[PDB]
From Swiss-Prot, chains A, B:
Belongs to the HAD-like hydrolase superfamily. S-2-haloalkanoic acid dehalogenase family. This is (S)-2-haloacid dehalogenase. InterPro entries: 2-HAD, HAD-like_sf, HAD-SF_hydro_IA, HAD_sf, PGP-like_dom2, S-2-haloacid_dehalogenase. The gene is dhlB. The lineage of its organism: Bacteria, Pseudomonadati, Pseudomonadota, Alphaproteobacteria, Hyphomicrobiales. The keyword Hydrolase applies. It comes from Xanthobacter autotrophicus.
Length: 245, 245
């Protein structure tokens, strides 16, 4: 039976677009651009560092990705500036119905499995006021890999003591849904962007920057095994788990 | 001493934009979009499949990436349609100066190290009439990983009997430059997009779709070791090798 609900962090429980106000500062007029590329490169760098066998924690990844992004704009900020701005990733606003969701899931074990480095995750959850909502906040850092590497998902059993079959994994990220499924978890994908809306947006005339990234990041990935469930919001999870098993 | 010049294929020797006509037929008015997302997802899927430890050859990856891309537009092509259109990747036009470059590089050992499946590569190289320009056309397939996994680069010594130190690796792809450097090759990066032009393009007002992808794919990656050399075109490599030795 489902004994634990384990959540992806960035993009699932926390809004990675909420760095917008801060990025709009590093380049007025380019906040949206920066937000999108920063996130895209954060992901790419986590995958590429892991696949090369050259791990560095998510804090290093986040700053390298920011440096790349600002560099495309012709900037060359120093490490101090990068470290200060990157703190935006430790203050992402949780999704509105995150709190209520975790609450209604109080009976079950509740955890996070994230690429985020140990200190990033504590700040992020604390700042979101959700520290008391998790029995464990698990960082991939100990394994020195990034999702979707199987060793990342292995941590759930190592920490919670439950087997893959007894875990409901939750993510808004297609590649993470894929990695969780490959590992053996049941998965609930959070799909906040309706496929039909994206399709029409993509033909609504000239394709805007933001549309490109939605197109790259907010769909199920074709190589991946389908999630067991798809809900439009975290709030639908408790009711999903009720009439589930 | 440099005894062999090993080339990345897609994006380096061959123009991944040359699928322009096939994609425009697939969805008139959206050929540019499809071209860009197809290539982006092709890369992502190669990385993610490898990192999950769920390898499929580049032919499956290419078809899956295409299926994803067309799906964003609201289409649902059958496998027959996908296999047919994906053929476009086995017809990529080589860059105008590749032939000359390869010619002037003899009698140095010359090879390709590519994600492409064996059949994709031989059909691609044959169609461009470059079969006799290479001592070896190496697919990563034997190792069942994708670049930048170190095993893919390990194939070079296995096939050519030259050590990493005796190899000049050539690539226009930042992640591949990074992988080859991590492994131990000397690397010449082919940089077709001037940083200063990109920076100004990204400030020129509304950011056209195509600018996004250049922004994502045509720079050195911040996590990667810097290439030993950077040239504007493949035609410059023979000159580079001389002034080098």
């Amino acid at each position: 039976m489902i004994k634990a609900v384990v959540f992806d962090a960035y993009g699932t429980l926390f809004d990675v677009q909420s760095v917008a106000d801060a990025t709009e500062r590093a380049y007025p007029g380019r906040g949206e651009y920066i937000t999108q590329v920063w996130r895209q490169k954060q992901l790419e760098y986590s995958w590429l560092r892991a696949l090369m066998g050259r791990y560095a924690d998510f804090w290093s990844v986040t700053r390298e990705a920011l440096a790349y992004t600002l560099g495309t704009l012709g900037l060359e900020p120093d490490e101090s500036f990068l470290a200060d701005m990157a703190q935006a990733y430790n203050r992402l606003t949780p999704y509105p119905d995150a709190a209520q969701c975790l609450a209604e899931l109080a009976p079950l074990k509740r955890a996070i499995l994230s690429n985020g480095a140990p200190d990033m995750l504590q700040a992020l959850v604390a700042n979101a006021g959700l520290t008391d909502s998790f029995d464990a906040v698990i960082s991939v850092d100990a394994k020195r890999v990034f999702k979707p590497h199987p060793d990342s998902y292995a941590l759930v059993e190592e920490v919670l003591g439950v087997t893959p079959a007894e875990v409901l994994f939750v993510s808004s990220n297609g590649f993470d849904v894929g990695g969780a499924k490959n590992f053996g978890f049941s998965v609930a994908r959070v799909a906040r962007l309706s496929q039909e809306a994206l399709a029409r947006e993509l033909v609504s005339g000239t394709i805007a920057p933001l549309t490109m990234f939605k197109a790259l990041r907010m769909r199920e990935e074709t190589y991946a095994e389908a999630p067991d469930f798809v809900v439009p919001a975290l709030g639908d999870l408790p009711r999903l788990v009720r009439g589930m098993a």
